[model samples]
Target chain A: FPAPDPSVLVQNFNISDFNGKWYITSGLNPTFDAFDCQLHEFHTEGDNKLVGNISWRIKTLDSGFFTRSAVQKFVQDPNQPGVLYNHDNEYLHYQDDWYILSSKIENKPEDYIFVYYRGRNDAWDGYGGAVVYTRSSVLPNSIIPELEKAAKSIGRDFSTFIRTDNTCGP
Target chain B: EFPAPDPSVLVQNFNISDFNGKWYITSGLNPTFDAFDCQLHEFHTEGDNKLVGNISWRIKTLDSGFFTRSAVQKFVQDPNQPGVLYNHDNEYLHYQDDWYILSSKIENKPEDYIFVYYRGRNDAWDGYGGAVVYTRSSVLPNSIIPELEKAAKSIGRDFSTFIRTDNTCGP
Candidate 1:
């Protein structure tokens, strides 16, 4: 009847202040597990308003068909504030949400830091569990500890979080 | 057995790199294999120029429900038709067949709704050939189905009987 209070959400989290391209570094494997080049580009509407777009590709099962969900609608949970969700509305309503458990973006560099929370109810959920955030294409080792602790704050084990493959180099 | 399917119609400028990754089978005309939702092909580059992976499935057999099998696949891309590939597998005694990349395109402008065709022949019966089509999600756009049908017909194959892979079936 009760669940542990979700790991403390970021305090004084403006949500809109954190904007730019945030790359997904790692997460629990659920549904969108076999995807690559996972990223989200955010746009600030005004104060306390944020909209985003996602760009990524997913391979079927063993291998062959590579499908991509690009620049699709991404918006913050008006009720949940820092939390954001994106779905494939054309056909399948695939919902993937990110809860900003913590962030260090205010007055930061062009690309800032974000720790997105991940969790899923069904086996179809891809890469669920809190996601360790990143600033650019590749995640730096320096922040691995911060991300790992944030995941632990939610009773999630970082070991089970799988690193995503974003490389498409020839 | 019979001459392999022709590769003249293979997609031009096929980026073999794009060929690598996992794909879910939507429908197919192959006779040797039955359609299953658990079916998917995993392809990746191996060694220098070899493309290899497995055609894996989680399905029940005659008396077993926990059946799982994976057949190794090794393919070579055609120098001329980048999309055309020649596949050889030990399961079929190294018998090779032409795997054509008839056509491919992304849907939803940028939202990846990729549709691809991988057709080949089996030695079980001479000229017994078929093709498997896949989409990123489940069914392909209605517009793409007609194209796949026409492509198969051009190779003397019928796409009418193509079976869609339904993943809900328990293994």
Candidate 2:
């Protein structure tokens, strides 16, 4: 997949505003299909670092959902505010380089953040996807066109995106 | 004395074209210059994504005459960052400065205002930084003061302590 243009990345990204719980409303790539009710919680660690966790449920063959979580950390570029490097797992090996492509704020609170992630691990060659995080669990119908436009800006097809099922639990 | 704002407070997707044209300096944080009247700035886009700036201000002299001084400067936007820009002091030659659009309300139309943060060093000064608020009109409304204060607080500054610039100099 083609990488997102650096020019489109969010500028003056405020980590403080970005810190909080977010619902994974929409995502691209096959990895999204394996999970449901995905939720992400983020907190600022230091000046340029973010500590977070992604929790989700995997549906079993018997229609049972199994909970899973992963610890994640991101370090912001010293010069570039929106660009970040991600590390997941205990070893803290580099996992992905993600860009906050765009963000919208309403009522002085973050409304949504659009992220473009590119895999860095050799095992997952040619892996890349876009994720949409919203303040609400259910993605609004009105914003779909805007999301589609953002996807198109990065050369991705929005029709192929997986609208995740976030109705599992509270 | 508040430090410069963090990079996070910078406005996202800042369009340089929206920032072009004349602006009146209404208030400033920790200004270095002495008593001044009627400070104005004009900016226009030049070749190679560069911004040409002309700054003019009046200084109160001993003879009760206001001395007008003007200088030209250049700014180049960072290729990778949308709101970050590098300031080139054409007059001083060796001064290095970085400029950031801390906050902007251009989308608000007639009530547009911009908060600009600048940090630089020259031969005489080791390190110095300040912030300035610019408005489209010389006359500022009381309703906009709260927003200006909020922008100041984002950078750990007290807006009440900011020096008010006089733009009442008549034509």
Candidate 3:
């Protein structure tokens, strides 16, 4: 209640600012363990710091392309690391998750960064879509409540920290 | 032989002034596109309609946006062409550090814009993409925020990564 004051050092887009190279839906690496992914990118070497890379494809290896890199730093709570999120509504609020109809999560690491909504634009048959997870405290709090109650009908206020900083780890 | 300038996006009222200033990402699309494919686009055109603005874009191998997106058709004056040239409509702009690698925009009148267009981490909008960043207001391409923060630090990680003092992103 009183320890909710670290949220204001912003950046909705950085990695040079544009956000158009995403496609790694579902907990990331979703099984397979290591092959047939190729193209899981994340950018933002500033504001909260981010660095990600995930290449795929490997009939087993020999030369199909495989890459891996992760670098993140965010502290808005969950113990704290950098401190930011200051748009203020006490500490930003607009909770609900009904299937990503519209979602938002961040209640003192309650769900640990999780946002899902497909209203804007998304695809999968192209190779699977619907990926959003940014909460770098090293993630793994049992992993976001039913995807934050399905993002509560997605009415508005989906909260963004660069779509949950890749859930960094968990 | 390179003609294509008549597409826009809009929203609400002030629309946020199309996002406020600094945009330079030209790797290949117009004229010859120069300044090494510059890209800045800070955000906010406050007064509005400098030909529809809005941005948060930045260049250098591009990261969040701008591999193809442009705006800023206000800096005119090229009876022939020289340094800092910017005519829009046909082709002229030619800066390197300040970014104009060959911009050329002038088409005007499409109803103005502000259609969502806020995607960093890469949203991909072809038509000036999110490079729509606002605030430039004439005198024509002057300085353009230190090459738009060196093209948002060539893919973010430097110019403070994204930026802040008030706001950034889109309309």
Candidate 4:
């Protein structure tokens, strides 16, 4: 098992290039478990603000049926470059942080490795673990190993990361 | 018009992580008669505690296509009720609608489901009472359809009268 390291955040990361839809290729379990075609759409409101819409299909906890939804709010981290927050007062009264610790595209803008962290404390896997996201549902095998390595540096467990189904057509 | 009924509740505190994604409208009631079938709901997080949602449905009047409406709402936690969130949306002009997740099956299993109750009041003299059962698919699962019906009945809404969203709108 390895840990997640934030030492190497995305260098020269251009927010403009990052402003688009990114699929959840593989990552922590249950957080995105049983869901297929998970995606996050990020866009800029102004130079100082970032807004996002996260959508996915939900599998029934108990049946063959599933539901689709994008809920609560993904609060933006004003001071941070690729950080967002989420909180639901009544149902999910806890505050969570979603961070894009680094990116795979150093020369050009592409593939992103992020840590979707939540829980009472700031520790890794406090609620969920880190995950790897790609511009598409499918990722090149070459980038996966690098993403696995980055997950280890941040004190996150790569083994805990589960691969999601990308078979959804709609 | 707002329907005077029981207040919104949360049978169980919804898992916060599972709150993100799109929800297909399996069945819903619109007393205002402005909604159509094949409704799709998209939601996301904003700021520290706000919910930004977009609703798209089939429209048949002048344009026979999909129409989208965006609602920027907030989640309010009741100190007394832990598992429920009061969805407060005041972004719209002339009216405010607050919805409640009264009953839900949060297990991501076959029985997973959620039913919500929404009430609204506008500057005009109209009372709007709406309820919707959101599922993974446009069609309700056979096994859970009855359960949703019973849940809606408990809230004074007849799920049988609710319109089912057919994918015909290409949503």
Candidate 5:
């Protein structure tokens, strides 16, 4: 599936608003499967870049209970407000376009962010999906309809999204 | 305080990618007498060639509640030696434990077990070393025990001293 045009990205996105920890509430992609307790810690490196510390637990009957951590860097697009390019340090040639499709960060329980990603490598080509991130592990039920609406705007089926399990202890 | 294994026994063709999955700690030399039930270890590729791992085990409390406790670990393969690796944890940032893959049943056509030997020493402690057998199945078949014992003997370790870990607790 093709990614949405950059024109639809959230306007005037502030990188500082995304600092600190965010929990992966729901995801619609293959990489999101068989994983739980996903968390991202973002730290602004400069005005236009962010260093993210990502950690997640492998969730499979045979995988046992354990967590893995990785590092990624995000660079904001100069021309686009909410558009960024993520670079995987481990995979030198691996990069992905991240679009902030929607967000409501009023510092309330309903605060949430919806990010759409499209991979840009041979193995990850045509891999386009979206994920919902929230300040808390548990997303408020009141905000799901809005998220689903945003999902549909980008031709994604919200019902098929996997609700990530974040019940593991820190 | 156990002696190190012979370098010849170290698997020269150790493939880290093939070892990336959940493994049950079926047996171990209980150097510290800390053997617990449902001991499991999982390894996954991190950035480049490094490996990030998780070691977990179930703890049964008096209240009948079983809790799974796990610790994150990092492993870096030695460039000079194929089977040699260094293990690091958050607690011991500077101390690197020597981990060696003694035997690996890589061809999964039927065989499914690996033998690893590790030695660790910090500033506060002298050193501790032990051997362990990691199996693809939590309950290793009784038939394979003899082969593993032999493998242990090859590494200069007594197989009888290696305690069997209980895998009855569910994940």
Candidate 6:
């Protein structure tokens, strides 16, 4: 009967919600150089947040395949733009640096939940051409603010994206 | 023509220092005669020749199959004029009857990733030209040979003239 306070809306979840793939729907499509990318989440036994991780691959590519049980030693520090991670610290270091990882909901989920996630190492949405802009880039600027408000509601600081990967911690 | 600079106004800077390391072909009569038409191409010192960069025809033969970012070569050239080949290396020289592979330094042509100057089996050089994609040689096995034959025979060039060059592209 009464409207719920939008500020009170929290992403209340236990450790279980942390697992499963959270698709970046509102974000950008891939650039010309990079066809597509994936974002996955999972839980680990220890206090390590990114201990369980998944990175999706381009299905169209013949060699396209997913990496399982990938220990996301993802180091996200505050105020840092670039985030680096290595498979074994020898070779294969992907520079999947995200700038601002915020979320917002324009309307209510029942009406419309316009969500967003932005990136900084981002030429993806800008110069990827008109078709790519429609297809790629992180979430739009419109969707970020509300999601940020929702995220900031929890103790998990949205600012941690620079120095730390958005762990989505409970 | 309005957007492109006038041919007379265009200057041919032929020094490797002037034209080397990752450049896409703006335009040409047939195809890229001085560059590779791809999104990326690297240039490094060839053996002890530090200034020239690594001379690698290290051809990356591919099909509609799989390919990654690492499969590429680094090369540079002095330059090309309105007529003659830029340099007479195997990378630039193709002796096939009708089949010929011409390239320009293509490092920024994303869609025209890598262009090929082929004669086809019909002996018509005008219609035969395409790209070299991202694939492993082992996977494509006999890619150049067969493709060359097809291109040559299409242009009526005998397969006997088709010869894979000794251009080495690497670190």
- The best candidate in terms of DockQ: 1
The segments of candidate 4 whose C-alpha lies over 4 angstroms from its true place after superposition are: A1-170, B1-10, B31-37, B46-49, B55-71, B82-84, B87-94, B168-171
Model 5 misplaced regions, further than 4 Å? A30-33, A54-70, A87-91, A122-124, B1-171
Superior candidate under TM-score, 1 versus 6: 1
- Whichever of 4 and 6 has more lDDT, that candidate is 4
Please list the Cα RMSD from the true structure of every candidate, rounded to 1 decimal place.
10.2, 25.1, 20.2, 19.5, 18.3, 19.7
Better of 2 and 5 by lDDT: 5
- Summarize candidate 5's per-residue lDDT along A65-130 as a digit string, tens digits: 544335567888888978888864564467778899889989886688899987866565776778
Expressed as tens digits, the lDDT of each residue in B10-58 for candidate 2 is 7776777776876666778865332133344556787757777643334
lDDT of 3 by residue, A5-89 (tens): 2232122322232122332223321322211111233455444433442122223355333222222222132234322222222
In model 3, how large is the Cα lDDT of residue B63? Answer: 52
TM-score of 5: 0.46
Q: What interface RMSD do all candidates show, one decimal each? A: 13.0, 28.7, 16.9, 14.7, 14.7, 17.9
iRMSD of prediction 2: 28.7
Best by TM-score: 5
Please list the residue runs of candidate 2 whose C-alpha ends up more than 4 Å from where it truly belongs after superposition: A1-170, B1-4, B32-35, B55-71, B89-92
Estimate every model's Cα lDDT from 0 to 1.
0.52, 0.67, 0.26, 0.54, 0.69, 0.27
Quality of candidate 3's docking, in CAPRI categories? Answer: incorrect
Chain B TM-score of every predicted model: 0.66, 0.79, 0.21, 0.69, 0.78, 0.24
TM-score of 3: 0.20
Among all windows of 10 consecutive residues in model 2 chain A, the one with the lowest summed lDDT is A30-39
True contacts kept of each: 0.00, 0.00, 0.00, 0.00, 0.00, 0.00
Whole-structure CA lDDT of model 4: 0.54
The residue-by-residue lDDT of candidate 1 on B1-171, one tens digit each, is 224446566566665655566455666665232343233444578754567764333444566444333345678776767776777655634355556676676433322323334534445644545567655543444656677777777666666776555331111
> Quick one: how many clashes does candidate 3 have?
93
Give per-residue CA lDDT, model 2, range A7-55, as digits (tens): 7678778777657667677778634122323455577887887776443
Give the TM-score ranking, best first. 5, 1, 2, 4, 6, 3
CAPRI quality of model 6: incorrect
